[PDB]
Design a protein around this nucleic acid. Structure first.
Ligand SMILES: [Mg+2]
Ligand SMILES: [Mg+2]
Ligand SMILES: [Mg+2]
Ligand SMILES: [Mg+2]
Ligand SMILES: [Mg+2]
Ligand SMILES: [Mg+2]
Ligand SMILES: [Mg+2]
Ligand SMILES: [Mg+2]
Lengths: 142, 314, 190, 225, 101, 144, 67
RNA sequence: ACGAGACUCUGGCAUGCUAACUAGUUACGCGACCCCCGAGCGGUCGGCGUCCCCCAACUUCUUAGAGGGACAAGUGGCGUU
């Protein structure tokens, strides 16, 4: 039994989540906790989307552990989703044939492109003369 | 009297197909380099829906991949890129086993020796470097190799004295002697830059081509100009049939086959049915290769496609 | 697999009765999502917000006023509770109720103003389907917001009542009254 | 104890600024151009660049021997760590500070404003500069102040190339009725070496080489050597 | 044989990298064991001031910025060879500190 | 198939641990628990009179997850936003005399011990108790 | 807007005049030739010049140009 | 010819290069706890070794250097084409 594993990262505004995926039985954990114990649970389906789209059969041969850092809660969740999807695709590319990777990538991309491609948006700098990047202080005459 | 008929098409790339490599050991697999920084190993099924599907992607190059060549036993692969480095991959696991560094410009061509113990590489640095398997550049040539870019470098598979042939953008075809690495022969017949040079399996004839559109056949052992065959716009690739005594040239829109005994065209390969797309230029034929079986031509095009042509005997 | 909003509301049975608005309401198979929260970039290009699912558009338009800007999780919760209340009250798919409410709320003919700051004179014009959808969503959210203010009644209940009345066509809803008044003024400005 | 790197670099900058100000006030008459401090653990060397070194050195080296004293007195670091050297500028026409001082001392002698400005402009252009600008502002004639402007050659105003292609100098001169202000701008020429000009070219200047002569091939020739 | 750390601090990166390359090449020409150069995070000091010497006009601000770059090199060697290689290293603008841990 | 603390829901785990500590009866409770508020940004005293047990359970859980926390760290953990009249709100820390007494009481139960580097950490007995509580919580969640 | 300033156009026209043989319809080969023959101190300026050279070569292949 | 553009800093991409105990990852040992109905190639560990006599490898994640990358380049329309 060779030691085959892949580490992939996903990003949101400042949040970075790195998923390590190796041969296993189907364990998926984030920071040591199960997927269903991550907060907030309002956006729980956003975290279960890749599994629901691909099924437990494709995840049944791998163990995945995610470490998240930075950003906010929503950004961390969106980073975790992308890290999971990219890690599974990268594992299938290396240790399975190319056809399975193509199928998985097509299924993921059709539903949502951000599962595999990062969002480049970042906060804009403040400029003097106003509260923020675009807004200006109240002008007065007379 | 043979007709070449399009059999199928392979679609796995996102960029221009730049080189196609075959091997006698494994007839069922092909290796194709492309401009998407990826080298695709194709597994041939010869099925109804798909003639072949991609099997494994070799991705370690930051820039375009220019040339790819398989080893004698078909177990390793060699590749040059525009990032200035060469890569030696294990085809079994799809991992880079060796890296060759030392070029300061894009590496345009790379060639394996007949014993898989010598490696040659020509760069846009106007430099020809000779390396071993371990990755050490044994000898670099700055002896006025070319005043311009070096397009292609090839080894001569002949029982006689080993020979390396190169073509330059300075309109010259140079012939160097192996194991001593000295300039042996110069050939000045072209009007324009050169793209490809190839050697017949006998090791006696060589073909040179470029922008001028004329494929010039020279004699290697004796060192004289033999023939000149007119072609299309630009000659991208030149190949010899291992068992049929043919010369296949890859022009932009079409592919030409010449019989060297009669100097007569055997076939021209091109197809397009849509009338609306006639305004746009047809995709160019970039790469060309013969299967060791001798019955299928593999042609890589600008259209991000690889087309297979089957010989039909009449 | 079958994708259902919030895990329980299917989208296959929903159908749109207006041919004009079919291309601007996204509720169908390729627009079926689990949650009305995607963090998508729909405002980057013109007409791109017609590809945004209509539930997410309602959620976006419910983050008012300025004391509620950016609180999108509370809005998702409000929408979930409102859909639950709608299903309990009517007994049908809340997505169909939302589609009917948006169809009925959108004004069909408007009046464009030519105004010298005090006096204003107007002329009747037509309304594009995208503006119809936008104005319907705005009117529904405004009606729910004004209903919930200074009253012992959850915002979800008020939103459910507004949607039910708008889908029914009853005049008890804010959106229907506003649409009727706008169309009456447009008719009188012919 | 010791201080942090931020404070250390800020202190070095402040020391260099004060040293330059003191040297300017002391050696304006001698065409003082600049100061360069090379710090070595053995000794800290100070190179004084000025048009003429005879006045800076003084007779038998007295005056410079005074300066290296007061510096040691001022900043307090121990004796034997001070050593001043005087080096003449390679080309005095391409230095804006030296030309501003020359114009100031020509005006102080009673020379006409226009004649002195034109002489400085001609000398700068003859030195090899791409262009030059000289502005003199104040009560040149009468109770009402004005400004005279003398320009020649090329000149760039906006962008990053201004930082390394333009040399600027601002000076004040006290005449009987008040202060006159002098501004001098010099545009350096492009020099492949870094001696008298910027090494890098202007960003938008593209130099296309002329192709070499090529012999037209007629007949295929094979040459073996 | 000492574990010796060389810390290089500079304001411009070209001179700093030139000095680091010179030190690495010199040390490796003596067949020594070198670690690094490891680059510390760049420090950015900022001063925001008003342009006007008085309080009249539009409120415009100048943003002055200074950047400090830091490198570390590790050497397993006696003191004498380190001073041999270091003597050449003197460069204008770069502060070199040699310590024995 | 062994349940650990990270597997179960944290709020239910805190409730169960607080109930276990209260039922044990060996926890030491200060005299002034009924007359104090837990921070200076609080307006009122805590609603639940048995708040000391809940705070002790929360502190034990935090020491389980991240060991070596002192009085200042616990004070920062339980800090919150302070509204001050017509001025903008600001972050404010908790009371030190509550955190210190909670830590001392947990040390009196042989569940918390002094850390070598500084602060406090859990004893193997405390870890065993927390894992047992987590197993009970998981069993109760799954059975129902 | 994507209008090219006269610097790019002048450089492209001079390059096409002097080195018409070496150029073609490929942007990347053209940008590799331009850095070989011409001195452009910027990467973006070189890319703009190469991109205009490719367009001008296509126009020349279509037919004669006014310039 | 100046201004505009070009230019400088900044934000996005690199599983390609350079190399790090004042950054880490993975793996392997020790230890604590849980499940004796599945006790295990089991789970959790911001708990301790693995550079410094000898006791692991490697930069994905962190830092910052050198380079690449985008040019309205490809296709289809509209334009004096
Ligand atoms: Mg902000
Ligand atoms: Mg803000
Ligand atoms: Mg209310
Ligand atoms: Mg300009
Ligand atoms: Mg500008
Ligand atoms: Mg808090
Ligand atoms: Mg308040
Ligand atoms: Mg990295």
């Amino acid at each position: 039994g060779p030691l085959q594993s892949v580490q992939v990262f996903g990003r949101k505004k400042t949040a970075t989540a790195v998923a390590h995926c190796k041969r296993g039985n189907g364990l998926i954990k984030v920071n040591g906790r199960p997927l269903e114990m991550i907060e907030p649970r309002t956006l729980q389906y956003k975290l279960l989307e890749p599994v629901l789209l691909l099924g437990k059969e494709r995840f049944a041969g791998v163990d995945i552990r995610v470490r998240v850092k930075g950003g906010g809660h929503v950004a961390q969740i969106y980073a975790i989703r992308q890290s999971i999807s990219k890690a599974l695709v990268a594992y299938y590319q290396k240790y399975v044939d190319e056809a399975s990777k193509k199928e998985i990538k097509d299924i993921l991309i059709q539903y949502d492109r951000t599962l595999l491609v990062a969002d480049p948006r970042r906060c804009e700098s403040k400029k003097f003369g106003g509260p923020g990047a675009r807004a200006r202080y109240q002008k007065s005459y007379r | 009297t043979e007709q070449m008929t399009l059999r199928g098409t392979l679609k796995g790339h996102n960029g221009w197909v730049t080189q196609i490599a075959t091997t006698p050991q494994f007839p069922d697999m092909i290796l194709s380099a492309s401009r998407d920084k990826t080298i695709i190993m194709w597994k041939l099924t010869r099925d109804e829906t798909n003639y072949g599907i991609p099997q494994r992607a070799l991705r370690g190059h930051s820039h375009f991949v220019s040339d790819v060549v398989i080893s004698s036993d078909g177990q390793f692969a060699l590749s040059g890129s525009w990032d200035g480095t060469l890569r030696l991959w294990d085809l079994t696991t799809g991992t880079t086993t060796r890296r060759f560094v030392g070029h300061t410009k894009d590496v345009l061509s790379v060639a394996f020796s007949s014993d898989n113990r010598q490696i040659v590489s020509g760069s846009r640095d106007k430099t020809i470097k000779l390396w071993n398997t371990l990755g050490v550049c044994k000898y670099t040539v700055q002896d006025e190799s070319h005043s311009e870019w070096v397009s292609c470098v090839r080894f001569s598979p002949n029982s006689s004295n080993p020979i390396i042939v190169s073509c330059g953008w300075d309109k010259l075809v140079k012939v160097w002697n192996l194991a001593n690495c000295k300039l042996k022969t110069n050939h000045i017949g072209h009007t324009g830059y050169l793209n490809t040079v190839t050697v017949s399996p006998d090791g006696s004839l060589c073909a040179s081509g470029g922008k001028d559109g004329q494929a010039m056949l020279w004699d290697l052992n004796e060192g004289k100009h033999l023939y000149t065959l007119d072609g299309g716009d630009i000659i991208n690739a030149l190949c010899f049939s291992p068992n049929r005594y043919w010369l296949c040239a890859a022009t932009g829109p079409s592919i030409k086959i010449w019989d060297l005994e009669g100097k007569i065209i055997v076939d021209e390969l091109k197809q397009e049915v849509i009338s609306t797309s006639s305004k746009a230029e047809p995709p160019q034929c970039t790469s060309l290769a013969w299967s060791a079986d001798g019955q299928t031509l593999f042609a890589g095009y600008t259209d991000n496609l690889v087309r297979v042509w089957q010989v039909t005997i009449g | 697999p079958d994708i259902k909003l919030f895990g329980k509301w299917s989208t296959d049975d929903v159908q749109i009765n207006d041919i004009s608005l079919q291309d601007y309401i996204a509720v169908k198979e390729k627009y079926a999502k689990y949650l009305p929260h995607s963090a998508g970039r729909y405002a980057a290009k013109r007409f791109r917000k017609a590809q945004c699912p209509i539930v997410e558009r309602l959620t976006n338009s419910m983050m008012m006023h300025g004391r509620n800007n950016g609180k999108k999780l509370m809005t998702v919760r409000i929408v979930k509770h409102a859909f639950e209340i709608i299903h309990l009250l009517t007994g049908e798919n809340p997505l169909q109720v939302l589609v009917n409410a948006i169809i009925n709320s959108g004004p069909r003919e408007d009046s464009t103003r030519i105004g010298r700051a005090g006096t204003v004179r107007r002329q009747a014009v037509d309304v594009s389907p995208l503006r119809r959808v936008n104005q319907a969503i705005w009117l529904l959210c405004t009606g729910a917001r004004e209903a919930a203010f200074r009253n012992i009644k959850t915002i979800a209940e008020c939103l459910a009542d507004e949607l039910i009345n708008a889908a029914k066509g009853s005049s008890n809803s804010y959106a229907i009254k506003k649409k009727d008044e706008l169309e009456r003024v447009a008719k009188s400005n012919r | 104890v010791q201080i942090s790197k931020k404070r250390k670099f800020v202190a070095d900058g402040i020391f260099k600024a004060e040293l330059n100000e003191f040297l300017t006030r002391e050696l304006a008459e001698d065409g003082y151009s600049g100061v360069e401090v090379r710090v070595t653990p053995t000794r800290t060397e100070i190179i004084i660049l000025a048009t003429r070194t005879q006045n800076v050195l003084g007779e038998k080296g007295r005056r410079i021997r005074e300066l290296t004293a007061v510096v040691q007195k001022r900043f307090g670091f121990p004796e034997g760590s001070v050593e001043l050297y005087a080096e003449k500028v390679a080309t005095r026409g391409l230095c804006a500070i030296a030309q501003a001082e020359s114009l100031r001392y020509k005006l102080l002698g009673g020379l006409a404003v226009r004649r002195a400005c034109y002489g400085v402009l001609r000398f700068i252009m003859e030195s090899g500069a791409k262009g030059c600008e000289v502005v003199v502002s104040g009560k040149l004639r009468g109770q009402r102040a004005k400004s005279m402007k003398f320009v020649d050659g090329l000149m760039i105003h906006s962008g990053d190339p201004v930082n390394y292609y333009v040399d600027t100098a601002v000076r004040h001169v006290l005449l009987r009725q008040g202060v006159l202000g002098i501004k001098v701008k010099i545009m350096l020429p492009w020099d492949p070496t870094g001696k008298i000009g910027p090494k890098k070219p202007l960003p938008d200047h593209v130099s296309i080489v002329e192709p070499k002569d090529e012999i037209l091939p007629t007949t295929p020739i094979s040459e073996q050597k | 044989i000492h574990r010796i750390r060389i810390t290089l601090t500079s304001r411009n990166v070209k001179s700093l990298e030139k000095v680091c390359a010179d030190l690495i090449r010199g040390a490796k020409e003596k067949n020594l064991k070198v670690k690094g150069p490891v680059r510390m995070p760049t420090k950015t000091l900022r001063i925001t001031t008003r342009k006007t010497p008085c309080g009249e006009g539009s409120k415009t601000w100048d943003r002055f910025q200074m950047r400090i770059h830091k490198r570390l090199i590790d050497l397993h060697s006696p003191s004498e060879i380190v001073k041999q290689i270091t003597s050449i290293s003197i460069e204008p603008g770069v502060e070199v500190e040699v310590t024995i841990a | 198939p062994g349940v650990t603390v990270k597997d179960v829901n944290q709020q239910e785990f805190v409730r169960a641990l607080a109930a276990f500590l209260k039922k044990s009866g060996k926890l030491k409770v200060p005299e002034w628990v009924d007359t104090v508020k837990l921070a200076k940004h609080k307006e009122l005293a805590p609603y639940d009179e048995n708040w000391f047990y809940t705070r002790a359970a929360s502190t034990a859980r935090h020491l389980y997850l991240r060991g070596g926390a002192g009085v200042g760290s616990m004070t920062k953990i339980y800090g919150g936003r302070q509204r001050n009249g017509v001025m903008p709100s600001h972050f404010s820390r908790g009371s030190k005399s509550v955190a210190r007494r909670v830590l001392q009481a947990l040390e009196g139960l042989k569940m918390v011990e002094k850390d070598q580097d500084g602060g406090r950490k859990l004893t193997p007995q405390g870890q065993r108790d927390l894992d047992r509580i987590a197993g009970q919580v998981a069993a109760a969640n799954k059975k129902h | 807007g994507r209008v090219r300033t006269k610097t790019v156009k002048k450089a492209a026209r001079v390059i096409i005049e002097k080195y018409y043989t070496r150029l073609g319809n490929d942007f990347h080969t053209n940008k590799r030739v331009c850095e070989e023959i011409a001195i452009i101190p910027s990467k973006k300026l070189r890319n703009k010049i190469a991109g205009y050279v490719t367009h001008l070569m296509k126009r020349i292949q279509r037919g004669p140009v006014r310039g």
